[PDB]
A paper describes a structure:
RECQL5 (also known as RECQ5) is a member of the RecQ family of helicases, which are highly conserved throughout evolution, and function in many diverse cellular processes with the role of maintaining genome integrity. Specific roles have been established for RECQL5 in almost every cellular process involving DNA, including transcription, replication, recombination, chromosomal segregation and DNA repair. The Zn2+-binding domain consists of a pair of long antiparallel α-helices (also known as the helical hairpin), followed by series of short helices and loops, from which a cluster of cysteine residues bind in a typical Cys4 tetrahedral arrangement to a single Zn2+ ion.
Crystals of the Apo form of RECQL5 were obtained using a construct spanning residues 11–526, this includes both D1 and D2 RecA like domains, the Zn2+ binding subdomain, and a short section (residues 438–453) of the previously uncharacterized RECQL5 C-terminal region. Crystals were obtained for the APO protein which diffracted to a maximum resolution of 3.2 Å, and the structure was solved by molecular replacement using the structure of BLM helicase as a search model, with two chains in the asymmetric unit. The model is complete from residues 12–452, with the exception of loops 250–260 and 321–323 which could not be modeled due to disorder. The final 74 residues at the C-terminus are absent from the model, and appear to be completely disordered from the electron density maps, indicating this region is disordered, consistent with the results of various disorder prediction servers. The most prominent difference is in the relative orientations of the D1 and D2 domains, with the inter-domain cleft almost completely closed in the APO form and considerably more open in the ADP bound form, with maximal displacements of equivalent residues of up to 30 Å. Similarly, the ‘closed’ APO structures cluster at the bottom of the plot with RECQL5 being similar to the APO form of E. coli RecQ, and chain B of APO D. radiodurans RecQ (chain A is in a rather more open state). Comparisons with other RecQ family structures show the ‘closed’ APO form to be more typical of the conformation found in other structures, while solution studies show that the ‘open’ ADP form predominates in solution. The APO form is believed to bind to DNA primarily via D2, with motif VI forming polar contacts to the AR loop stabilizing the low affinity state. Finally following ADP release the relatively long range charge interactions between the acidic residues on motif II and the basic residues on motif IV (which are no longer shielded by the nucleotide or magnesium ions), would bring the two domains close together to form the closed conformation again.
Numbering used by the authors: 12 to 249, 261 to 320, 324 to 452
Write the structure that this text describes.
Amino acid sequence: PERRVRSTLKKVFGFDSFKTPLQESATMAVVKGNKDVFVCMPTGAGKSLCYQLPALLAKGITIVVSPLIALIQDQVDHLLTLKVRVSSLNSKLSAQERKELLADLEREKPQTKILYITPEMAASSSFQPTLNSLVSRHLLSYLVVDEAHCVSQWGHDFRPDYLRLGALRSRLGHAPCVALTATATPQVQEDVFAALHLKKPVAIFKTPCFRANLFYDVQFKELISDPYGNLKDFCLKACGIVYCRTREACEQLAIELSCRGVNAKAYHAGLKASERTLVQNDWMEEKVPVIVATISFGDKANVRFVAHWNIAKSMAGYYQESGRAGRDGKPSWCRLYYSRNDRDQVSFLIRKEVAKLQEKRGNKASDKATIMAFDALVTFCEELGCRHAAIAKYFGDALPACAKGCDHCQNPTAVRRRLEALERSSS
Ligand SMILES: [Zn+2]
């Protein structure tokens, strides 16, 4: 029972023991296949190893639901190097490759062990009959729902195709379901259980937001004399990402940093399908050490810094973006740059998209959630107190008694006066 898990852990990867006992607590509940489980912890090996382990353990194949296509390839190629039979069904996947795999799942004792899928492909009318041949033949081991908060209409990243998966679990009661996420919002948590129709009750496994290696400091653009210098000075003490709003803002900073010595390259949807995949592969190979990107770039362990030039659309989103730093456990720095003009620029767009929705559909409780998400982040910088403690109130996590890992922990007087300095700078 417990013996099989440890023997299959060190064999494939090379791990003496689990990172946290909560990882074993989650894994054992999945291995059991008795209940439906909810996993909520930061990205990396930890959370993935909770579905990757019982899949090989139990006899059958897994259906992993992840929306990111580029993320799917990053996790299938790393899995293949660990010697596992893994497949990935996406929209870009050709019909010749499709029939090779479509006939594989319908055949006796299929060759592939792990199957990656996007919500658009799984819920589709075309693939719909293929899973029924595994539904009846008992080959459907588990149902994996990565990035679970996209079915919320209260969450920072609502993806509509996530709603189709809702009744899918209630339709297929034969296999247990695992809901994986990082966004620990109580309204979103409750929504995940209801919208996905998860088997009541759900064994919830949650990990704290705080990370010792991360330093969260808030800088203010409205009071900095040389902002481009202040940015490269932070950048020099270090791979790493510099997030911002527009495709032209990152294009500006990619060359504005490069000239100062610290080489940086831009990333967004504006770059070609071949260019996007190239600069992403040129990032891992440290020829692109510093990467300037938008919301589009969402894995590497060595992420020394996550600086936000422009204020993020949501408080939940900022946590997801900044929390990509120091996956290895090594020290990293997460800086947020504030300006009431940049603030207003987003607030105006947020109010413009919401008003366009009301002009077509009408008023909704979900329409208010988007606005309230940004307001939760505008307070994060404009308010006095510890940065890690502000994360704790938003998601509901425990109060982390921090020291030398936050701006308030380093100087609760210098940043304090900087707030009073911001108000007088208006007129
Ligand atoms: Zn602090």
